[PDB]
């Protein structure tokens, strides 16, 4: 034990002699193979921010995005493999519009992340498919204000401040040290990477109590907050 394996328990989602699921453990490494980091935090009025990697310069930067609009009031940031990320965004859009059509009101944030987690659980049980290696959710609740939710490939999921990707643990430790609104996010992202980014390098989305719509900021607005940081 602690490193035992019998047969095909390294090739499909069956139990090890210890009680671990190895493919679901290996699915977290696919998030780090993406080579990215995102930061999300909420205040009393929630924000997500992630890097933009643009290496080729043949890319149309209007189409490279890791911030997605789920419905009018809920947005999300993905992290990991790109096609699986677009798959779970399609699935979250379909479950949110399905909830609205069945039940007559806009879907809660926690009832979206519980639904995506109950979808993602099925691939860690049936043997014939692989788990999707890729999501942080933000939206304004009613009796709770801003919400931050994080689902993972194992199917778990609620947060005040979090991070995902390659610098998950260090930015998590930084936010743990600090918490004991956008400026906290952009300092947390700039600290662990030590890049001190350009406005073409990060994208920020805000959801507010004044504007409950998910809103994706323009370049000059992120440049204004970067230069507000730059004078400290």
């Amino acid at each position: 034990s602690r490193g035992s394996s019998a047969g095909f328990d390294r090739h499909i989602t069956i139990f090890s002699p210890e009680g671990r699921l190895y493919q679901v453990e290996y699915a977290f490494k696919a998030i780090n193979q993406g080579g990215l980091t995102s930061v999300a935090v909420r205040g009393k009025d929630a924000v997500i921010v992630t890097q933009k990697k643009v290496p080729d310069k043949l890319l149309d930067s209007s189409t490279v995005t890791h911030l997605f609009k789920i419905t009018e009031n809920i947005g999300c940031v993905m992290t990991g493999m790109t096609a699986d990320s677009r798959s779970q965004v399609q699935r979250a859009r379909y479950e949110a519009a399905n909830w609205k059509y069945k039940y007559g009101y806009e879907i809660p944030v926690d009832m979206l992340c519980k639904r995506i987690a109950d979808i993602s659980q099925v691939y860690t049980q049936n043997a014939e498919m692989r788990p999707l290696g890729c999501m942080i959710l933000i939206g304004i609740d009613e009796e709770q204000g801003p919400q931050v939710y994080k689902c993972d490939p194992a199917g778990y999921y609620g947060f005040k401040a979090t991070a995902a990707g390659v610098k998950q643990t260090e930015s998590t430790s930084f936010l743990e040290k600090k918490v004991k609104t956008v400026e906290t996010a952009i300092t947390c992202l700039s600290t662990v990477l030590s890049i001190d980014f350009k406005p073409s390098e990060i994208e920020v989305g805000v959801v507010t109590v004044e504007n409950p719509k998910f809103r994706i900021l323009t370049e000059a607005e992120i440049d204004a907050h970067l230069v507000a940081l730059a004078e400290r």
Binding site: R10, H11, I12, Q23, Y26, A27, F28, K29, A30, I31, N32, Q33, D56, K57, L58, L59, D60, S62, T63, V64, M81, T82, A83, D84, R86, S87, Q90, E128, M129, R130, P131, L132, G133
Partner: protein
């Protein structure tokens, strides 16, 4: 290795090897480039003919997937005809339901999901082909989208797919595509195809070219014969 017999199995370091082996199968096949410009999209494909017994028109790598959308492919071409028929059915269903021509962003993200749907299951294999989509309309401008067999789709100013992708991408990067007319873009496209060509291995090839833009009022058409032949002439005299 034991971890690469199935697309439904992660390796211990977090890689899916059947997809990353299919992206080696893409860069076995010949060069296809596409350049988006100010007012339209131009496609260019190095079409090998393996034996001169073969008629003209065999093994076309430029497909029409809607009347305003074209497509250029690379890789195992038998899969590429299947993805051409998926894109044709998807654009047909969008015209039938919603009453107008399908936006290229939505078409790329339907066909990217159909490509991605095979990189999850042990009961299928991932497609062995990458492909591009180009379109033009008065309301949307010109757009160029590229899909690799992992399912990943982005919008491009200029792209090169196939076995000579990097030497072609550095050469497309040298150009000012953003401000030129398409009749001035075909000459570069034809330049770069003959530049990156391997002449000592896998001889006897043909040039295949098509554009979509304002000069064809959004209809996707092949390049006419004299324009293609004078592009071949300009590129051969540039080749020395």
């Amino acid at each position: 290795t034991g971890y690469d017999l199935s697309a439904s199995t992660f390796s211990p370091d977090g890689r899916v090897f059947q997809v990353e082996y299919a992206m080696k199968a893409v860069e076995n096949s010949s060069t296809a480039i596409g350049i988006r410009c100010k007012d339209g999209v131009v496609f260019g494909v190095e079409k090998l003919v393996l034996s001169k017994l073969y008629e003209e028109g065999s093994n076309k790598r430029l497909f029409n997937v809607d009347r305003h959308v074209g497509m250029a492919v690379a890789g195992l071409l038998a899969d590429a005809r299947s993805l051409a028929d998926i894109a044709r059915e998807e654009a047909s269903n969008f015209r039938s339901n919603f009453g107008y021509n399908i936006p290229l962003k939505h078409l790329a993200d339907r066909v990217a999901m159909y490509v991605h749907a095979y990189t999850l299951y042990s009961a299928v294999r991932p497609f062995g082909c990458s492909f591009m989509l180009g379109s033009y309309s008065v309301n949307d401008g010109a757009q160029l989208y590229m899909i690799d067999p992992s399912g990943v789709s982005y919008g491009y100013w200029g792209c090169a797919i196939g076995k000579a992708r990097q030497a072609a991408k550095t050469e497309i990067e040298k150009l000012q595509m953003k401000e030129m007319t398409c009749r001035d873009i075909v000459k570069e496209v034809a330049k770069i195809i003959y530049i990156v060509h391997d002449e000592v291995k896998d001889k006897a090839f043909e040039l295949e070219l098509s554009w979509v833009g304002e000069l064809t009022n959004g209809r996707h058409e092949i390049v006419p014969k004299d324009i293609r032949e004078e592009a071949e002439k300009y590129a051969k005299e540039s080749l020395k």
